[PDB]
Amino acid sequence: GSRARVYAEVNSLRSREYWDYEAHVPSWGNQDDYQLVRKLGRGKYSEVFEAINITNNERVVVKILKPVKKKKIKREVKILENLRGGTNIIKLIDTVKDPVSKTPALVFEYINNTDFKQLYQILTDFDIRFYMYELLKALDYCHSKGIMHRDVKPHNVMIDHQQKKLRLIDWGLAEFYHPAQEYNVRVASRYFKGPELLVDYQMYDYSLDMWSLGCMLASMIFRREPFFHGQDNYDQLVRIAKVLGTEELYGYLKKYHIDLDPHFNDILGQHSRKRWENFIHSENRHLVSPEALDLLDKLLRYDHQQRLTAKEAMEHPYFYPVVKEQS
Numbered sequence: 274g275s276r277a278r279v280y281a282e283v284n285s286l287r288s289r290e291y292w293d294y295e296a297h298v299p300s301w302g303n304q305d306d307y308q309l310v311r312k313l314g315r316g317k318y319s320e321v322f323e324a325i326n327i328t329n330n331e332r333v334v335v336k337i338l339k340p341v342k343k344k345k346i347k348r349e350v351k352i353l354e355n356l357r358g359g360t361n362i363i364k365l366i367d368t369v370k371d372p373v374s375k376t377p378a379l380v381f382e383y384i385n386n387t388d389f390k391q392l393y394q395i396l397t398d399f400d401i402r403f404y405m406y407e408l409l410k411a412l413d414y415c416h417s418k419g420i421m422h423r424d425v426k427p428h429n430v431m432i433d434h435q436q437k438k439l440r441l442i443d444w445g446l447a448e449f450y451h452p453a454q455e456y457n458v459r460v461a462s463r464y465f466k467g468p469e470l471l472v473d474y475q476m477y478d479y480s481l482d483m484w485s486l487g488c489m490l491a492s493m494i495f496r497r498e499p500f501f502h503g504q505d506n507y508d509q510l511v512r513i514a515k516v517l518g519t520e521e522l523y524g525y526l527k528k529y530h531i532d533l534d535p536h537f538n539d540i541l542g543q544h545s546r547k548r549w550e551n552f553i554h555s556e557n558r559h560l561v562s563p564e565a566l567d568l569l570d571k572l573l574r575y576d577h578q579q580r581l582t583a584k585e586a587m588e589h590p591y592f593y594p595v596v597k598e599q600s
């Protein structure tokens with residue numbers, strides 16, 4: 274079938290307890306130590322509040338989990354435990370429960386983020402290189418720990434643009450990678466779904482996250498956010514094929530023995546592969562360089578096996594100015 278080019282066997286080389294999250298027994302502390310200040314957001318399975326730890330006055334966030342998704346709670350908890358101390362990964366401070374209802378919650382460090390819709394409009398060339406390099410550190414770390422994030426998107430990449438801090442958040446869709454395992458393709462936000470998800474190819478790997486990061490890179494350097502703006506999952510693949518080309522799509526499908534949903538017959542059309550330079554104009558030209566386009570071209574590929582790994586991306590010349598500054 275398909276296997277990851279890096280870190281393919283890393284979970285099988287670790288103790289079973291590392292990846293067998295259904296067997297994980299979290300230590301649940303007392304949520305009563307936290308005073309909720311403000312609701313920050315709400316999703317299908319969780320709500321996040323700004324909070325104060327009343328025993329030490331530290332500001333934190335509390336993510337209250339819709340209880341009874343028990344397996345999924347253990348998964349997120351175990352993944353965060355395994356990622357402890359990872360570079361640019363949101364820090365899990367504690368796992369707590371309401372001591373009466375037993376509803377679980379996760380306590381994270383607080384990041385004073387700048388909303389990406391405002392931020393992306395003011396980023397310089399160097400800013401984009403810097404933040405993408407920092408994001409790559411988090412992905413390389415989690416992939417090396419055997420974990421796919423599966424929901425990389427601007428809302429999950431919190432950036433404090435004053436302190437220059439970046440954290441990859443919301444590990445609720447993340448999974449452990451096991452060679453030959455078939456995964457649910459209902460992951461990621463529509464605009465950040467890799468072609469593999471859109472064509473129902475279940476034997477995917479860490480390279481899914483590299484598609485999503487390529488989409489974010491394109492949106493930043495070209496100032497089109499989101500970059501591929503589908504109206505539904507079918508239209509999402511059409512938007513991708515209008516840039517990457519249809520002949521190239523068909524070669525990918527043939528290589529992996531993938532059959533397209535026949536509804537695509539009515540909507541895909543015929544599209545040449547476009548030059549990345551076609552997206553340059555006066556409003557984004559200062560953010561685009563030959564190195565940026567070369568990197569992007571090596572991320573936004575149909576063939577998940579040919580996309581750069583996070584490490585190879587970090588090694589690309591596009592980041593040399595950042596490396597030089599960090600030394």
Ligand SMILES: O=C(CCCCCCCNc1nc2cc(C(=O)O)ccc2c2cnccc12)NO
Nearest residue numbers: 313314383384386387388389427431432442443
């Ligand atoms: O794209 C950006 C803007 C992002 C838009 C803000 C989303 C609002 C939710 N707000 C927070 N959600 C968290 C979720 C988790 C988790 O689920 O793991 C962990 C930590 C936080 C968090 C920490 N500090 C402040 C706010 C939040 N770039 O800045």
